[PDB]
């Protein structure tokens, strides 16, 4: 249906758009500031290419932005008990304050 | 294997004419495409030599919309009616692909010469 | 007001792009050159054309 709605139809189909947007928020939850991003994406899907891992990002930037996002400035964390490696130039640490654990 | 289109849809019957409210009661062969956003008529096929305007009411009844037809597209169909010089039409505003499905199905599962 | 009024009259209804008014009706050119090898090509001799 994505191919159908992309290269065959002519006007927007709200039902399919809502379906795809629900799918995206289910497997590609985002948090966005002004060009600095952090993504918590599913792993078993991205491993078999159903959500863009990193190389789709590289290709998209290469063909639609006329730059080359070299894979030396793109972190990747395989664990979650420690937060994102770097967002807005603030490393994130999990600490025990009061009686529970919070991120600082 | 880029295909023209599978699983197309089929025809309805509606009135047509050449100017404004020329709808006698019903003179055409409209082709439906029942989209979920409403029934979408696609093409026309009348034995009248030219027509310009056709009008099919909506699902409400009070809303009847006039439609504007193509220039002639002429060919003959071999059917139980024997020789049948028909004249086929579409609705303006129609992209190439809709002509695609209409002509593809008509030439795939209907007879013409 | 001589050259400008002369050239505007040549337009269809007196409308011309702005990027050409200093290209024809300016009486003082200023050229900035980074290095000698680049100076060689453009500002050769005591007079040049551009």
């Amino acid at each position: 249906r994505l191919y159908e709605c992309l290269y065959r139809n002519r006007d927007v189909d709200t039902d399919f758009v809502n379906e795809f947007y629900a799918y995206l928020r289910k497997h590609f939850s985002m948090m966005i500031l002004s060009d600095d991003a952090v993504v918590c994406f599913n792993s078993t899907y991205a491993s078999q290419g159903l959500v863009a891992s990193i190389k789709n990002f590289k290709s998209v930037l290469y063909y639609q932005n006329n730059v080359f996002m070299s894979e030396a400035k793109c972190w990747t964390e395989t664990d979650l008990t420690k937060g994102p490696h770097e967002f807005c130039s603030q490393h994130t640490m999990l600490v025990k304050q009061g009686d529970d654990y919070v991120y600082l | 294997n880029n295909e023209l289109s599978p699983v197309a849809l089929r025809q309805m019957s509606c009135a047509a004419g050449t100017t404004q409210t020329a709808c006698t009661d019903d003179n055409a062969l409209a082709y439906y495409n029942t989209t979920k956003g409403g029934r979408f008529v696609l093409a026309l096929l009348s034995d009248l030599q030219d027509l310009k305007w056709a009008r099919f009411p909506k699902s409400d009844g009070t809303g009847t919309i006039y439609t504007e037809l193509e220039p002639p597209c002429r060919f003959v169909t071999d059917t139980p009616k024997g020789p049948k010089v028909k004249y086929l039409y579409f609705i303006k505003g129609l992209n190439n692909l809709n002509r695609g499905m209409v002509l593809g199905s008509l030439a795939a599962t209907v007879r013409l010469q | 007001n001589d050259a400008l009024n002369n050239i505007i009259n040549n337009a269809r209804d007196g409308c011309v792009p702005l990027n050409i008014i200093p290209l024809t009706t300016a009486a003082k050119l200023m050229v900035v050159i980074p290095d000698y090898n680049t100076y060689k090509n453009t500002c050769d001799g005591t007079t040049f054309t551009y």
């Binding site: 063909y63 006329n66 730059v67 | 880029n2 002509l103 | 050409i20």
Partner: protein, 308 residues
Amino acid sequence: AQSFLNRVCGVSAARLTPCGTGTSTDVVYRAFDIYNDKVAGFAKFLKTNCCRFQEKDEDDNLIDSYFVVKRHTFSNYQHEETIYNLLKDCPAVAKHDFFKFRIDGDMVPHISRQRLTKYTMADLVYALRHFDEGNCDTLKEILVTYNCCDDDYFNKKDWYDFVENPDILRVYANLGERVRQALLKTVQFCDAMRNAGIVGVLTLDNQDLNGNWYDFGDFIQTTPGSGVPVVDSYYSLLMPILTLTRALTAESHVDTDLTKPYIKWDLLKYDFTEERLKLFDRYFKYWDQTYHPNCVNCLDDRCILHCA
């Protein structure tokens, strides 16, 4: 066995040396744009039924000109015979050649396309729009086969960058003439087929790099004068390449020829609302959507974006 080669060489240039392994097909790895009732997409599949032969010039050195002969069923054979014999007149059609040949005990029908190119346009568009510097071989082969660059240029590290090494712009700018010629031949094919009354959908995996077309296996016929090219995938996929290889630069010349000085436009001209229409009519004739140059007349935001 060996008579197959001499039979493949119909009436031209018996200088063929098979790249396969005899009278059997060879498996290749190309791109496709498939959508038939089950699976759609645009990716790199695995073609299997292609006996590929290569033509070489004198001194017996290889040269880019191939013979892609394909084996398939009987209905496809007669359907293609009819459609091709209907469309033989057009200059922008690879010269097909049909025969029936026996392998073991079966009178298997053959189709023998002639004088094609190694990499069809779908491969160029894909390998440029899915870049990955760890695995880019088709792009290198395409770039070095067409005299754009030479293989010594690929040793200068950071050769694919757009920030450093900005000479990659000039390197890519050597495919513009090929792309423009391909577009013009597509227009010619569309006109010819619309005249000859055929209906179908064009694809990027048919038009090889020279410009020739083939594969009429999906088209169907109608009464002459009422044909229609379904062209949305074609241009909608070729679009991001048209301003990366600069195929429109051949128009800023006095006669559409790269051996002549630039046209001297009058400075006072600013409207320019006719050359755009002429270019859009000559190159994008069958693109099925109104294009209004002055974006003021646009109906709503979507049309504004589409015309911009």
